[PDB]
Structure 1
C-alpha cells in the first residue's frame, strides 16, 4: 500500500466581518493501513496573529488532540482550479488554499512574490502530501534549493551552521553526548530560519512547528518534510524580513530570553571529580594566585551524600566546612552553584523521598511509580506537570538553601535520562510506534535510556506526548524555587530544553570532548541557540570528555572567553584542566578574560537587548550583514553584538587564520593600531600567534567598556572608557544599559535603571561625540564615571577645542549626565 492518499477541501471560507481568518474542512481521500489510522476529517485554519505572523493550524475536526498546554507555553488561542486566498493589507504574507486533489497551500510575500512555504503536492508522489494519522503527521514544503539557506532545527552537533542538504534531523530529547555529530541530543527546537539570497538579498522568514512530539525533519535542499509521531500541525510563519525581525517575532510567541544577573557573565569553574571541600578551596585559591578572574565555583555530584539531591557527603563535603567555603566565596565577591538531578533515590530513610511519596509527586507507569536508574541507583522522577511536584521541588530547594546558601542551580540529566531501558508494554503503540523516528541515528526505540512512553503525568498526559517538555518543565519549576527563596535575579543552567526554555534558563552544549573538532562545533551550536531564543549559551572550555592538551586548552580559553556563558568543566576520568595549570594557558586566559571583563557592560547591554527583542548576544555575521551572501555559510567566526567579530584559530599548529571580513574597516580590540580594510568582503590571513586570538570592531560602532578586575563586582566600580569607531559613510552609534545587576524585573516601571545611547559624527572640520540618557537619576546615584574616549577610524588626529588613534583623557564625566563633546582636527 501507498503511505497515504491525502485530503480534499470540502469547504473553505474567509471570515468576513473581522480581521480575516480562513477556515476549511478537509476530508480524507482514501485510507491506508501504513503507519496506522488516518484522521478522516480535518479542521484547517489560517489566521494572522500579528501582521507579521501567520498561524496554520490543522486538527481533527471531530476530536481534541494533544497540544502543548497553554499553561506551559502561553499564546493566543486558535481563531473562532479553485483557490481561497487570505491576505491583510498590513501583512506581507499571503496565504492560498488550493482545492486540488489532494489539496495544497502556499504562503508567499506580497512584495516580492517570493514563495516562502509551498505545500502544493506533486500528485504522483505521496511523499509530498499532507498525511495525518494518529501517530504520523507528514507536512512538506518545496524550497528553492540554491536560494534558501536554512538554520536551526536543534539540538544537533554539526560542523556547519547553515544546514547541509540531504539529511534527517531528529528531535527527541536524549542523553547522547554532543561530541557525536548529527544525532539527536538533549533538546528539541522545531524552528528554522530561511534566509533567501534572491529575489531580494537577505530577505528572511522563520517557520516553527509548535509540537512536542518526536519527529524526523528531512531536508533535501529542494524540499523539507516533517514526519511527526503525534500531536497536531500548528505551524507559525514569521514574516521577517530581516533575520533580527524574525527572532523578535519568534520570541514574541515562545517567550523572551530570561534576564541574567551581571555575575553570570564572569568566569565559571567546575569539574566532575572534585574530591572534597579542601580541593575546591584550593582551586579557588590557585585561580587567585594566578591572577585569573574566577567569579563562580561549581560543585558536581561529588558534593552529595551518595549522589542524592539535597544532601551533603558528611565525610568529604561536611556542612560546617561547606558553609565556611560559601561564606568565604561571598566575602570575596564570588558565587556558588551546585548541580541537581531530577531522579529521587528511593531509600526509605531519605527525607526528600519520604516527602515526595507523601505528596504523591512521582511519574507513574501501570499505576505504580516508575523506577529508573541514575547516579544514586534506583530513582523515581518528579512529575513536573503536576502542581504538587512543583510545590515539592520548591520546598526541597528552600530547605537546602536554608542550610547552605547557593547562588543558582545547574539542572542536569533532565531529558529525563535513565540508565536502563524498560520493556515495552505489550500491545502499546506508544511504546511501539508505527513510524520509528531516527533516534540515536539508528531508528532506536524512543524508550531507550529514558522514561517509557506509556508512563503517565498529571492530567492523564502520556510521556509519549510530554517527553520533550520534561527539561523545560523542570526549568520552570527550578526558576520558581529560586525566585521564591531570594529577591535577586536568578541563575539557572539546564541540559535538556524545548522551544521556550530560554525564558527560564541558560544552556550549555553538554558532553562535548577535548577534540579540535569540538572546539569548532561550539560555534554553530552557540549560533543555533541564539536562534532558539536561548542566548545564554556556551560549551565546556577545554572539552568535557577525554583529556585535553596544552595547545587545545590555550586555543579553547581564547575562544571560550567570548561565549555568552563561559565555564571550564571536565569529566572525572581525565587530566585536570583548570586554567592555571599550564603557564601558556594561564597567560592567554589573563589576556582574553581581561578583554571579556572590560566588555562586561557590553555583554550586559546585549543581554538587555535579547530580553527586549530576542536578538542573540553571539550572532551570525549575517545578522549585521544580511545583504552579504558570503556570510551565510560562515561557521567559524561570529559577532558579539552588532559590530565585534571573533575569528578564532581552530587547528593545531596554526599561527594564522584565514578569516572573512565584510566590507569596511575593522580594528583589533587588543591593539587599536592593527586594522583590516577591505572593499568587497574577502578573506584575510590574520596573524594569530599561540598567545593571541583575533577580535575586531567594525567602523560605525561605539562600545562602552569598563576596567579589568578579578570579580564582576569590582569591575563595575572602575571607570568607563568609551571606544568610538568612526565611519566615512555613516554616523557611529552604540548603547549601554545600566541597573544594579540583580533586579528581578529588568528595565521595568520601577525605573532603577538607565539606558544611554551614544552618537558620533564627523563634519568637514570637526567631530561631535554625544550621548542621550533615559532615567539619568539612577546612573547618577551609582557614581559611574567616563574618564576616557578613544576614537578610531580617522586618518587625522582630533583634540578638544594610515589610520591614527586619538585619545581624550581625564574627562571625569558622569555616565548619567548626557554630554555633547566637540572636537577639532589637527
Structure 2
C-alpha cells in the first residue's frame, strides 16, 4: 500500500474580528494500514502571534492530543483551484491554503513573494503529503535547492555548520558520545534557520516545530520532511528578515537566554578521576604557579560517596576538608561547581532515597518505581514533571548546600541515561512504535539505554511523549533550587536539553574526543546552540575521551579560550591535560586567556545582548555579513559579537591557516600593527605559529576592554581600555553593559545597571570619540575608569588638541560619565 492518502479541505474560514485568524476542518481521504491509525478529522489553524510570526497548528478535531505543557514552555494559546488566504497589513508573511486533493499550504513573503515554506503536495507522491496518524506525523516542504541554506535541527555532531544535503536528522535525547558524527545526541532542537542567497540576498527566516516527540527530519536539498512519532503539528514561522531578527523572534517564543554571572566567563577546570581533595588543591595551586587564570574548580562524580548525589566520599573528600577548600577558593575570588546525576541510588541507608520514596517523587512503570542503572548501581529517577519531585529536588539541594557551599550546579546524564535497556512491554506500540526513528543511526529502539516509553509521569503523562523534556525539566528545577538558596545569579550546566533550555542553563558539547576532527566539530555545534537560544556553550577543552597530545591541546586552548563557556575537562582513563602540564600549552594559555579576560566586559555585554534579543555571543560570520554568500558555508571561523573574528588552526603540523575575510579592514587583537585589508571578501593564508591564534577585529567597531588578572573579581577593578577601529565607510560604534552582577533580572526596571554606548567618527581634519550613558542613576554610582584609548584603522596619526596606531594615555575618565573627546590629525 501507499504510506497514506492525505487530506481534503472540508471547510475553511477567515476567523476575523479585530484580529485575523484562519480556521479549517480537514478530512482524511482514505485510511492506510501502514504506520497505524490515521486521524480522520483534523482541526487546522493558521494565526499570527506577532506581525513577524505565523503559527500553524494542526490537531485531531475530535481528541485532544499530547502537547508540551504551557507550564513547561509558556506561550500564547491557540486561536479560538480554490484557495483560502490569510494576511495582515503589518506582516510580511502571507499564508495560503490550497483546496487540492490532497490539500496543500504555503507561506510566502508579501514583499518579494519568495516562498518560505511550501507544503503543496506532489499528487503522485505520498512522501510529500500531510499524513497524520496517532504515532506518525508527516509534514513536508519543498525548497529552492541551491538558494536555501539551512542551519540547526540539533543536537548532532557535523563537520559543517550549514546542513549538508541528503541526510536524515534524528531528534531523540540519548547518551551518545558527541565524538560520533551524525548520531542523535543528548538534546533535541526542532528549529532550523533558512538563509536565502536569492532572490534577495541574506533574506532569512526561521521554522520551529514545537513538538517533544521523537522524530526524523529528512533533508534532501529540494525538500525537507518531518517524520514525527507523536504529538501534534505546531509549526511556527519567524519572518526574520535578518538572521538576528529570526533569533529574536524565536527566543521571544521559547525563552530568552538566561543571564550568566560574570565569573561564569572565567576559566573552568574539571577532571573525571581527581582522587581526593588534596589533588584538586594541588591543581589550583599549580594553575596559580603557572600564572594561568583559573576561576572555577569543578568536581566530578569522584567527590560522592559511592556515586551518590548529596554525599561526600568520607575518605577522599571529607566534608571538613571540602569546606576548607571551597572557603579558600572563595577567599581568593574563585568558585566551585559540583556534579549531580538524576538517578537516585536505592540504598536503604541513604537519606535522599528515603525522602524521595516518602514524597513519592519517582518515575513509575507498571505502577512501581522504574529501576534504572547508573554510576551508583540501582537507581530511581525523579519525575521532574511532578511538583512534589521539584520540591524534593530543591530540598535536597538546600540540605547539601547548607553543609557545603557551592556556586553552581553541573547536571549530567539527564537524557535520562540508563546503563541498561529494559524489556519492552508486550503489545505496547509505545515501546514498539510502528515507525522507527533512526535512533543511533541504526533504527535502534527508542528505549535503548534510557527510560522506557511506557514509564509514567505526573498527570498520566507517558515517557513516550515527555522523554525529550527530562533534562529541560531538571534544569528548571535545579535553577530554581539555586535561586531559592542564594540571591546570586545562578549558574547551571546541563547535558541534555530541549528548545527553551537556554532560559535556564548553559550546555557543553558533551563526550567529545581528543581528536583533531572534534576540535573543528566544536565550532558548528557552538554556532548551532546560539541558534537554539543557548548561547552559553562550549566544548571540553583538549577533548574529553582519549588521551590528548601537546599539539592538539595547544591548538585547543587557543580556540577554546574564546568559547562563551571555557572549560578544560577530561575522562578518567586518559593522561592528564591541565594547561600547566606542557610549557608550550601554558604559554599559549596565558596569551589567549589573557585576551579572553581583557574581553570579559565584552563577553558580558554580549551575554546582556543575548538575554535582551536572543542574539548569540559566538555568532556566524553571516550574522554580521549576511549579504556575503561566501560566509554561509564557513564552518571553521566564527565571530565573537558583531565584529571580532576568530580563525583557528584546526590541522596538525600547520603553522598557517586559510581563512576567509569579509570585505574591509581587519586588525589583529594580538598585534595592532598586523592587519588584513581586502577590497572584496576572500581567503587569506594567515600566518599561525605554534603559539599563535588568529583573532581579528573589523573596522566600524568599538570594544571596551579591561585588564588581565588571575580572577574575574580582580579583573573588574582594573582600568578600562577603549579600542576604537575606524572605518572609511561608516561611523564606528560599540556598547558596554555594566551591573552589580547579581540582579536576577538583567537590565530590568530594577535599574542596577548601566548601558554605555560609544561612538567614533572622522571629519576631514578632526576626529570625535564620544559616549552616551543609559541609567546614569546606576552609572553615576560606579567608580569605573577609562585610562586609555587606542585608535586603529587610520592612515594618519591623531592627537589631543600603511596603517597607523594612535594611543591616548593618562585619561582618568569615569566610564559612567558621558564624554566627548576631540582629536586632531598630524
**When the two structures are superposed, what TM-score results if normalisation uses the length of structure 2?**
1.00
| Aligned position for 1:229 | 229
Q: Secondary structure at the match of 1:812?
A: strand
**Distance in 2 between the 1:148 and 1:565 partners?**
31
Cα deviation 1:569-600 (Å, max 9, x = unaligned):
00000000000000000000000000000000
> Could you give the per-residue CA deviations for residues 250-273 of structure 1, whole angstroms, max 9, x where no partner exists?
000000000000000000000000
**Deviation digits for residues 223-253 of structure 1, max 9, x if unmatched?**
0000000000000000000000000000000
- SS of the residue aligned with 1:485? coil
Check conservation: 2:773, 2:779, Cα contact below 8 A: no
Give a deviation string over 1:499-531, Cα, whole Å, max 9, x none.
Answer: 000000000000000000000000000000000
- Check the 8 A contact 1:768/1:821 in 2, yes or no: yes
Deviation at 1:782, TM superposition (A): 2.5
| Alignment-derived partner of residue 506 in structure 1 | 506
Alignment check: 8 A CA contact 1:731 1:760 kept: yes
Q: Distance in 2 between matches of 1:79 and 1:780?
A: 48
Aligned to 2:357: 357
Count of aligned pairs: 826
DSSP-derived class of the 2:100 partner: coil
Where does structure 1 lack aligned partners over 5 or more consecutive residues?
none
Using the TM superposition, give the Cα deviation of residue 15 of structure 1 relative to its aligned residue in structure 2, in angstroms.
Answer: 1.6
Cα separation, 1, equivalents of 2:647 and 2:182: 25
In 2, the alpha carbon distance for the partners of 1:657 and 1:779 equals 43
In 1, are the aligned partners of 2:430 and 2:454 still within 8 Å (CA)?
Answer: yes
Paired with 1:194 and 1:140, the residues of 2 have a C-alpha distance of: 15
Deviations 1:202-232 (A, max 9, x none): 0000000000000000000000000000000
Q: Please tell me whether the aligned partners of residues 262 and 742 of structure 1 are also in contact (alpha carbons under 8 angstroms).
A: no
Alignment of 1:759-770 (within 5 A): 759-770=759-770
**Root mean square deviation, CA, Å:** 0.4
Deviation at 1:9, TM superposition (A): 0.1
Are the counterparts in 2 of residues 787 and 813 from structure 1 also a CA contact under 8 Å? yes
Cα deviation for residue 324 of structure 1 reads 0.2
User: In 2, distance between residues paired with 1:627 and 1:302?
Assistant: 50
- Partner of residue 624, structure 1: 624
CA contact 2:138–2:228 (8 Å) conserved in 1: yes
Question: What per-residue deviation string (whole Å, max 9, x for no partner) do you get for residues 67-118 of structure 1?
Answer: 0000000000000110000000100000000000000000000000000000
SS in 1 for 2:759: strand
CA distance in 1, matches of 2:203, 2:732: 25
CA distance in 2, matches of 1:16, 1:463: 39
Deviates more, 1:744-753 or 1:203-212: 744-753
Q: Do 2:273 and 2:572's aligned partners in 1 also have CA atoms closer than 8 Å?
A: yes
State the secondary structure of the residue aligned to 2:264.
Answer: helix
Contact kept in structure 1, 2:508 and 2:537, CA below 8 Å:
yes
Shift in Å, 1:200: 0.2
User: Which piece of structure 1 moves more, 777-786 or 760-769?
Assistant: 777-786
Where has structure 1 moved over 4 Å in runs of 4 or more?
none
Post-superposition offset of 1:743: 1.9
Corresponding residue for residue 376 of structure 1: 376
Q: Contact 2:172–2:468 at 8 Å: present in 1 too?
A: yes
Match in the other structure for 2:705: 705
Equivalent residue for 1:529? 529
Quote the Cα distance in structure 2 between the aligned partners of 1:741 and 1:158: 36
Deviation at 1:18, TM superposition (A): 2.8
Write out per-residue CA displacement over residues 308-356 of structure 1, whole angstroms, 9 at most, x where no aligned residue: 0000000000000000000000000000000000000001110000000
The offset of 1:16, in angstroms, is: 2.6
Q: Deviations over 1:423-449 (max 9, x none)?
A: 000000000000000000000000000
Question: 1:81 & 1:143 partners in 2: Cα distance?
Answer: 22
**Structure 2 residue aligned with 1:779:** 779
Task: Answer yes or no: is the 8 Å Cα contact 1:780–1:815 preserved in 2.
Answer: no
* Post-superposition offset of 1:36: 0.2
In structure 2, C-alpha distance between the alignment counterparts of 1:695 and 1:18, rounded to whole Å: 52
Rounded Cα–Cα distance in structure 2 between residues aligned with 1:388 and 1:820: 58
**Partners of 2:745 and 2:153 in 1: how far apart?**
31
CA-to-aligned-CA distance 1:182-201 (integer Å, 9 cap, x gap): 00000000000000000000
What aligned pairs does 1:373-412 form with structure 2 within 5 A after superposition? 373-412=373-412
Report the CA distance between 1:744 and its aligned residue: 1.3
By how many angstroms is 1:781 displaced? 2.4
Paired position in structure 1 for 2:48: 48
Contact 2:21 2:45 in 1 (8 A): yes
List gaps (5 residues or longer) in structure 2.
Answer: none
Cα deviation code 1:592-650 (max 9, x no counterpart): 00000000000000000000000000000000000000000000000000000000000
Rounded Cα–Cα distance in structure 1 between residues aligned with 2:63 and 2:821: 68
The CA distance in 2 between the partners of 1:130 and 1:492, in whole Å, is 40
Residues 537-571 of structure 1, C-alpha deviation per residue, up to 9 Å, x if partnerless? 00000000000000000000000000000000000
Distance 1:601 1:511 in 2: 30
TM superposition shift of 1:742? 2.3
Q: Structure 2 CA distance, aligned partners of 1:748 and 1:682?
A: 42
CA contact (8 A) 1:7 1:102 kept: yes
* 2:312 pairs with 1:312: yes
Indicate if the aligned counterparts of 2:702 and 2:725 stay in contact, CA closer than 8 A.
yes
Deviation at 1:750, TM superposition (A): 1.8
Cα offset, 1:689, TM superposition: 0.2
**Distance in 1 of aligned mates of 2:209 and 2:776:** 44
Cα deviations by residue, 1:271-322 (Å, 9 ceiling, x for unpaired): 0000000000000000000000000000000000000000000000000000
Contact 1:777 1:816 in 2 (8 A): no
**Equivalent residues of 1:156, 1:184 under 8 A apart:** yes
Aligned to 1:301: 301
SS at match of 1:418: coil
Superimposed CA distance per residue, residues 368-395 of structure 1 (whole angstroms, 9 cap, x where no aligned partner): 0000000000000000000000000000
Secondary structure of the 1:379 match is strand
The offset of 1:740, in angstroms, is: 1.3
2:607 is the counterpart of 1:583:
no
TM-score (norm 1): 1.00
Per-residue Cα deviation, 1:727-768 (whole angstroms, up to 9, x for no partner): 001000000000012221111112111100000000010000
CA distance in 2, matches of 1:323, 1:631: 50
d(CA) in 1 for partners of 2:310 and 2:651? Answer: 43
Q: Report if aligned partners of 1:188, 1:468 keep a CA contact under 8 Å in 2.
A: yes
Native 8 Å contact 2:456 2:463 kept in 1: yes
Shift of 1:775: 1.6
Instruction: Provide the rounded CA distance (Å) in 1 between the counterparts of 2:148 and 2:17.
Output: 37
Q: Distance in 1 between matches of 2:49 and 2:427?
A: 42
Distance 1:766 1:108 in 2: 49
- CA shift, 1:138, in A, is 0.2
Q: Give the structure 2 partner of residue 595 of structure 1.
A: 595
Asked if 1:276 is matched to 2:276, the reply is yes
Question: What secondary structure sits across from 1:88 in the alignment?
Answer: coil
Match of 1:133 in 2: 133
Deviations 1:629-681 (A, max 9, x none): 00000000000000000000000000000000000000000000000000110
Counterpart Cα distance in 1 of 2:704 and 2:4:
60
C-alpha deviation, 1:17, in angstroms:
2.1
Question: 1 CA distance for matches of 2:275 and 2:175?
Answer: 25
1:160 aligns with 2:153: no
Secondary structure class of the residue paired with 2:138: strand
Q: How far did residue 19 of structure 1 move?
A: 1.8
Per the alignment, residue 74 of structure 2 pairs with 74
Distance in 1 of aligned mates of 2:679 and 2:517 = 32
* Cα-to-partner distance string for 1:52-76 (whole Å, 9 max, x where unaligned): 0000000000000000000000000
Once residues 627 and 342 of structure 1 are traced to their aligned partners in structure 2, the CA distance between those partners, rounded to angstroms, is 46
Q: Residue 780 of structure 1: CA displacement?
A: 3.3
In structure 2, C-alpha distance between the alignment counterparts of 1:435 and 1:198, rounded to whole Å: 36
- For residues 347 and 540 of structure 1, the distance between their equivalents in structure 2, rounded to whole angstroms, comes to 32
Are 1:702 and 1:758, in contact at CA under 8 Å, matched by a contact in 2?
A: yes
Q: How far apart, CA to CA, are the structure 2 residues paired with 1:779 and 1:520?
A: 41
Any idea what SS the aligned residue of 1:26 has?
strand
Q: Please say if residues 345 and 378 of structure 2, whose CA atoms lie closer than 8 Å, have aligned partners that are also in contact.
A: yes
Cα distance in 2 between the residues matched to 1:807 and 1:751: 34
Secondary structure of 2:184 counterpart? coil
